[PDB]
């Protein structure tokens, strides 16, 4: 029995165009622990993204935070791309500053 | 407030890709403070919070030596689990363990914990009496017999009532500026038109610590649980957490809705609404 | 500080 990841993409602080911030991709609720996570800027992989140490919740499912510095603008598009044994293809979730 | 310490162990096999990876992480409440990883270049128990850095080299040597022993123990346990479930050596499997203690507001022990899972399913747990076990299946019954014979529960009881509480109180004092500080949520309601007919009201809680929070919507004073979209509490990356709750409301009916917030950083529960 | 388990074999 395996558990597919939940995915939220969001900023550390409320987004203001032109002001430096942090872009977060939080993957959680998944089992087993192997997981592949990319942060994207206009469709391209952002290099040197860092991530928290693997840990797990009371229901034994794993979670990770992937994050990188970014400066939001009106037009640049950001997303997180996730792959896991439970997913046929990588799942891409777009960043929306209102969520 | 109340406080807890937890240690989390994970052992993950990976046949064809070396020996199983073993990790240990220690937490006080929602603050990670130590980590061990067998895949690190030089595996050590290492500090992850500033207030643990003052422990001396004997502290780090002991935590490291135990974690290296545990790496081997849990690799053996993964081999045992294959035998217990009639599984082959080709697949990847995971053992997880949590243990630790919960303190009340007065610093006295509320309860202790020691539980294990195999492949994400509960395997065995120490009961709240810290004296007896609950096994999830016939495999865990075999372990239960071994642990009854070896008086494992008695050892865990002595740790959980003694050393666990004593070290947690020490950490709480050394980290009293942060571990013993609750940050209340910063709250606000945003409004997002969907159509001419409806809009989303989203109630935000930002910047709070610890993670435990309650966030709900009412319409005319009636809970809207089944009609509320409630995301999982999520880390901001600065130690704090975020959450939001959203309802879809008919245009012009926004003042019938109230958002309700409870957090231990708040003196009293908060009520807020959309403020145009 | 971690527990030094006397017996923790499955
Ligand atoms: Na996949
Ligand atoms: Na499995």
Same domain, B84 and B215: no
Residues forming a β-bridge with B148: none
| Domain shared by B149 and B256, yes or no | no
Residue B70, in any domain of the structure: yes
Task: Write down which residue in B116, B141, B174 finishes a domain.
Answer: B174
Is B218 a domain residue? Answer: yes
B63, C4: Cβ pair inside 8 Å? no
Angle at B99 (CA atoms; ends B92, B26), nearest 5 degrees: 85
Q: Per the domain annotation, does B179 fall within a domain? A: no
Distance from the Cα of B237 to chain A's closest Cα (Å) equals 7
Quick check: is B210 in a domain?
A: yes
Report whether B50 contacts B25 (CB < 8 A): no
Last residue within a domain, chosen from B118, B150, B174: B174
> Which ligand neighbours the alpha carbon of A34 most closely?
1
Structure tokens at B39: 């895949």
Are the Cβ atoms of C7 and B147 closer than 8 angstroms?
Answer: yes
B85 C-alpha to center of ligand 1: Å?
A: 26
Residue B194 lies in a domain: yes
Residue B126 and residue B191 share a domain: no
**Chain C residues within 8 A of B67 when measuring between CB atoms:** 2
Domain that holds residue B122: 3-174
Chain CA centroid to CA B247, Å = 28
Using the mean position of ligand 1's atoms as its centre, give its distance from the Cα of residue B86 in Å: 26
Domain count across chain B = 2
CATH of the domain at B8: 3.30.500.10
Asked if B211 reaches chain A (Cβ–Cβ under 8 Å), the answer is: no
**CATH at residue B202:** 2.60.40.10
Instruction: For residue B87, give Cα distances in angstroms to B78, B92, B130.
Output: 11, 10, 32
3-state secondary structure of A50: strand
The ligand with the least distance to the CA atom of A3 is 2
Q: Based on the domain organization, do B146 and B121 belong to the same domain?
A: yes
Do B67 and B193 lie in one domain? The reply is: no
Read off the DSSP letter of residue A59.
T
Q: With contacts defined as CB-CB under 8 Å, which chain C residues touch B164?
A: 3
Q: Are B16 and B151 found together in one domain?
A: yes
Distance to chain A for B63, nearest Cα, Å: 18
E-strand spans in chain B? 3-12, 21-28, 31-37, 46-47, 94-103, 109-118, 121-126, 133-135, 186-193, 198-208, 214-219, 222-223, 229-230, 234-235, 241-250, 257-262, 270-272
B248: β partners = B200
Name which of B45, B66, B146 is nearest C9 (Cβ-Cβ).
Answer: B146
Tell me how long chain A is: 99
- A5 Cα to chain B: minimum distance (Å): 12
B135 and B44, same domain (yes or no): yes
Distance CA A30, CA A83 (A): 11
Residue B217 forms part of a structural domain: yes
Residue B180 inside a domain? The answer is no
Judgement on whether residues B191 and B123 belong to the same structural domain of the protein: no
Instruction: Transcribe B237-259 into DSSP letters.
Output: SSS-EEEEEEEEEETT-GGGEEE
Given an 8 Å threshold on Cβ–Cβ distance, is A33 in contact with B10? yes
Q: Evaluate whether residue B232 is within a structural domain.
A: yes
- Chain A CB within 8 Å of residue B13 CB: no
Whether B22 and B82 share a structural domain: yes
Counting DSSP H helices and E strands in chain C, the numbers are: 0, 0
- Whether B152 and B225 map to the same domain: the answer is no
The beta-carbon neighbor of C10 closest among B24, B80, B159 is B80
Q: Residues of chain C whose C-beta is under 8 A from some C-beta in B?
A: 1-10
For residues A68 and A11, give the distance between their C-alpha atoms in angstroms, rounded to a whole number: 10
Please indicate the experimental technique that yielded this structure.
X-ray
Q: How many CB contacts within 8 angstroms connect chain B with chain C? A: 49
Residues B133 and B84 grouped into a single domain: yes
Please identify, among B174, B196, B225, the residue that sits at the C-terminal boundary of a domain. B174
Interface test with C, best of B27, B52, B66, B97 (most C CBs within 10 A): B66
CATH topology of domain A1-99: Immunoglobulin-like (2.60.40)
Resolution value in angstroms? 1.6
Same domain, B156 and B132: yes
Tokens 């949520």 sit on residue: B185
d(CA B151, CA B218): 52
């Amino acid at each position: 029995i395996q558990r597919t990841p939940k995915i939220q993409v969001y900023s550390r602080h409320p987004a203001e165009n032109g002001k430096s911030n942090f872009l977060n991709c939080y993957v959680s609720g998944f089992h087993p622990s192997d997981i592949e996570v990319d942060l994207l800027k206009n469709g391209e992989r952002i290099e040197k993204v860092e991530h928290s140490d693997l840990s797990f919740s009371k229901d034994w499912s794993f979670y990770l935070l992937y994050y990188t510095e970014f400066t939001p603008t009106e037009k640049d598009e950001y997303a997180c791309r996730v792959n896991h044994v439970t997913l046929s293809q990588p799942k891409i979730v777009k960043w929306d500053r209102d969520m | 407030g109340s406080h807890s310490m937890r240690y989390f162990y994970t052992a993950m096999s990976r046949p064809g890709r070396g020996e199983p990876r073993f990790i240990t992480v220690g937490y006080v409440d929602d603050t990670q403070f130590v980590r061990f990883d067998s895949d690190a270049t030089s595996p050590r128990m290492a500090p992850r919070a500033p207030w643990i850095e003052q422990e001396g080299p004997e502290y780090w040597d002991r935590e490291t030596q135990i974690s290296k022993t545990n790496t081997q123990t849990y690799r053996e346990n993964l081999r045992t689990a294959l035998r217990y479930y009639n599984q082959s050596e080709a697949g990847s499997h995971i053992i997880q363990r949590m243990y630790g203690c919960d303190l009340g507001p007065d610093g006295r022990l509320l309860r202790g914990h020691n539980q294990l899972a195999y492949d994400g399913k509960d395997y065995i747990a120490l009961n709240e009496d810290l004296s007896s076990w609950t096994a999830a299946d016939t495999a865990a019954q075999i372990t239960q017999l071994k642990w009854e014979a070896a008086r494992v529960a008695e050892q865990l009881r002595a740790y959980l009532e003694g050393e666990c509480v004593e070290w947690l109180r020490r950490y709480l004092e050394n980290g009293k500026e942060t571990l013993q500080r609750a940050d209340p949520p910063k709250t606000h309601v945003t409004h997002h038109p969907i159509s001419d007919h409806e809009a989303t009201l989203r109630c935000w809680a930002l910047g709070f610590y610890p993670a435990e929070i309650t966030l709900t919507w009412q319409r005319d004073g009636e809970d809207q649980t089944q009609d509320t979209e409630l995301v999982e509490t999520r880390p901001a990356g600065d130690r704090t957490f975020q959450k939001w709750a959203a309802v879809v409301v008919p245009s012009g009916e926004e003042q019938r809705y109230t958002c309700h917030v409870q957090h231990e950083g708040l003196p009293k529960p908060l009520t807020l609404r959309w403020e145009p | 500080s971690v527990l030094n388990d006397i017996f923790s074999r499955l």
